[PDB]
RNA sequence: CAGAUAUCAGGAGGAACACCGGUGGCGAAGGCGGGUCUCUGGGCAGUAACUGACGCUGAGGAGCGAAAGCGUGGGGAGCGAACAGGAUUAGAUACCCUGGUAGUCCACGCCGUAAACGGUGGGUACUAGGUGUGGGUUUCCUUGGGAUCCGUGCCGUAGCUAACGCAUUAAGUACCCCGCCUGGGGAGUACGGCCGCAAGGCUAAAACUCAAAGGAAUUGACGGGGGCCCGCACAAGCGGCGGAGCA
């Protein structure tokens, strides 16, 4: 319901193995859209497999990840006088780790491994430690949002 | 060469495009640099990046010139006034003072017309 | 402002061009003239106040 | 690219005076604004000092009178008709750019037409107000306030107008005079005449044409008009289709 004010949401419930909003949000992303168990067991057994290739706590492990991959300005289509001019707004938290998420789940179905378990798990430490295509594309993203200050006074 | 430790960046900030012509204090235009010795011809002249690009390159000349305090004399009205400004303080040139430096004919002589496009 | 004058009403003073710290009071940072009514005064003293600050642009001693 | 743009300094040029610059003034109207000087124009205000009806209108007539244009000699920096290339376009001659001649400025002249309109002729005696606002003087608090006379706005009485509107600054109420019109074009046109270097204008019908032309107001469709807004409309996420087979 845009046009009137903030749009109320769903809330979100943490894991029931692990106990963290952001693992679920995860689960929910990475959620082929009809599937939930298998899904859940998936981002499961991706989270195991960090786990020992990491050494550490699968939710902590994912908040890493979700820093590393957070971004902080985002661009819109506004269109300005028949010209496209990007304005950089600052990302609430909500929206960014919305984005971060999205990002990771996106580029985890993107590799290459057996299982998208093992995909996902992948991905999750490719955005932990700032090697994978969800950190890349959060540098991308700062960059092109700092090269284009000269619009950001716009202030939408 | 020489070094000019003190420069004024004097800005003909047509629409057209901002020749940011830094000048000795002297009153000699060391270098320039507008939007065409950036590249910018036609529209891409007179957009404002072509200001920020021509105000850094003429302030990486100033550097190359060790220039490094210059205060601003920006002519008439442009594309990218304080745009240019702020190239300059990023490319080694500090603020300093604005000045607009425009002619002011005080009900003087006669332009051409108009134009209706 | 909004008096009489600073002249129709305190009913003592006077304006010269020599006295062009008191002239000056009223131009702008160039010199630029108020409107007729910007100042609140009595409109002869303005019309009076504005061909001195004519006449003291060209007489160089005001920034014109 | 030769040093263009630019920057500084200098010189030359020609034109105009931004800010003050506005219901604010002035002027019969066209018009008036950089500053100085000289001459001059008219108005308003308080004393009747005075003249002692010397009032008003005003056909003919008189000059003045925007801009343009032409006569005569200069100016010309710029603009700039006309005229030049390029550009959209089917066509550019036009919008746009790239220049510039007369003119545009001055001097002396011509002409007299502009939407030269309060679209409200000149003048004069009466008809609620209110409120901005220029010049003056007085009268009343301790500058403050009032009155008055003149300039200048808006709204609003009476009353008037078809309504729109006017409304003490009339289109209300009265006089006196000057100018104009008798349905619409054909027509401010023919011709004569008048003035014109030139130009044009002033004066100006008719044949013929139609049963209208028109004004105020009402409801509608019509904006690259706005406002208030709202619509997984867009901003955003997701699933996608369009690629392939099959139906």
Redesign the pocket.
């Known amino acids: 319901?845009?046009?009137?004010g903030p749009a109320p949401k769903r809330p979100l419930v943490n894991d029931p193995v692990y106990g963290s909003q952001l693992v679920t949000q995860l689960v929910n992303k990475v959620l082929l859209?009809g599937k939930k168990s298998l899904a859940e067991r998936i981002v499961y057994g991706a989270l195991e497999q960090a786990r020992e290739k990491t050494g550490t706590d699968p939710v902590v492990t994912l908040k890493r990840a979700l820093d590393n991959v957070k971004p902080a300005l985002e661009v819109?289509?506004?269109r300005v006088g028949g010209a496209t001019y990007q304005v950089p707004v600052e990302v609430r938290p909500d929206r960014s780790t919305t984005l971060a998420l999205?990002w990771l789940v996106?580029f985890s179905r993107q590799r290459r491994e057996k299982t998208m378990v093992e995909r996902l798990a992948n991905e999750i430490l490719d955005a932990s430690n700032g090697l994978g295509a969800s950190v890349k594309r959060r540098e991308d993203t700062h960059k092109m949002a700092e090269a284009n200050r000269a619009f950001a006074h716009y202030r939408w | 060469k020489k070094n000019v430790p003190h420069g004024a960046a004097?800005i003909?900030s047509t629409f057209n495009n901002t020749?940011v012509?830094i000048?000795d204090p002297q009153?000699?235009?060391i270098a320039?640099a507008?939007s065409g010795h950036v590249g910018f011809k036609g529209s891409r002249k007179s957009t404002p990046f072509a200001a920020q690009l021509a105000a850094e390159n003429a302030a990486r000349k100033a550097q190359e010139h060790g220039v490094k305090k210059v205060d601003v004399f920006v002519?008439g009205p442009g594309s990218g006034r304080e745009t240019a400004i702020r190239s300059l303080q990023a490319a080694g040139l500090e603020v300093g003072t604005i000045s607009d430096?425009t002619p002011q004919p005080?009900?003087?002589?006669?332009?051409?017309?108009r134009?209706?496009? | 402002k909004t008096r009489?004058?600073v002249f129709?009403?305190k009913?003592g003073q006077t304006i010269d061009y020599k006295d062009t710290a008191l002239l000056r009071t009223y131009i702008?940072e160039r010199?630029?003239?108020?409107?007729?009514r910007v100042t609140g005064n009595?409109?002869?003293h303005q019309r009076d106040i504005?061909?001195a600050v004519?006449?003291a642009?060209?007489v160089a001693l005001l920034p014109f």
Request: charged letters at 35%; glycine letters at 6%; aromatic letters at 2%.
């Open positions: 319901m845009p046009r009137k859209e819109r289509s506004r999205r996106n | 004097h003909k020749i012509s000048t009153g000699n235009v320039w507008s002519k430096v005080h009900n003087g002589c006669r332009p051409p017309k134009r209706r496009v | 009489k004058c129709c009403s009913k702008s010199g630029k003239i108020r409107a007729r009595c409109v002869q504005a061909v004519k006449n642009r060209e």
